[PDB]
Amino acid sequence: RLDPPEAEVQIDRLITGRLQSLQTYVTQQLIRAAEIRASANLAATKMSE
Amino acid sequence: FVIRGDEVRQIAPGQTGKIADYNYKLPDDFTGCVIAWNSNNLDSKVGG
């Protein structure tokens, strides 16, 4: 629907939005992984003891 | 080159128009300058 010279702006907007979404998802995953790793360490300690 | 006085605008990068489409197109990322000056007195003939 657009000539590339002006469509680049829309493509950049979409890229920024999707990249921000990916970064947010990865940060949430990192925090959740830290929590689950703490739980797993507790579970291993409980198993051993 | 020589162009119609109304076509000077078409010389800007990333622009349409007959001249910029089929005669001479600047790259979208063109880096440089454009000079255009009236040459009516030196290029206009009574007979055309």
Swiss-Prot record, chain B:
Effect ascribed to mutating residue 45 to T: In strain: Omicron/BQ.1.1
Annotated stretches, region: Integrin-binding motif: 4-6
Annotated phenotype, changing residue 41 to K: In strain: Omicron/BA.1, Omicron/BA.2, Omicron/BA.2.12.1, Omicron/BA.2.75, Omicron/BA.4, Omicron/BA.5, Omicron/BQ.1.1, Omicron/XBB.1.5, Omicron/EG.5.1
Subunit: Binds to host ACE2. RBD also interacts with the N-linked glycan on 'Asn-90' of ACE2. Cleavage of S generates a polybasic C-terminal sequence on S1 that binds to host Neuropilin-1 (NRP1) and Neuropilin-2 (NRP2) receptors. Interacts with host integrin alpha-5/beta-1 (ITGA5:ITGB1) and with ACE2 in complex with integrin alpha-5/beta-1 (ITGA5:ITGB1). May interact via cytoplasmic c-terminus with M protein. May interact (via N-terminus) with host bilirubin and biliverdin, thereby preventing antibody binding to the SARS-CoV-2 spike NTD via an allosteric mechanism.
Purpose of the protein: Attaches the virion to the cell membrane by interacting with host receptor, initiating the infection. The major receptor is host ACE2. When S2/S2' has been cleaved, binding to the receptor triggers direct fusion at the cell membrane. When S2/S2' has not been cleaved, binding to the receptor results in internalization of the virus by endocytosis using host TFRC and GRM2 and leading to fusion of the virion membrane with the host endosomal membrane. Alternatively, may use NRP1/NRP2 and integrin as entry receptors.
Name of the featured protein: Spike protein S1
Organism: Severe acute respiratory syndrome coronavirus 2 (2019-nCoV)
Residues of the full protein shown: 400 to 447 of 1273
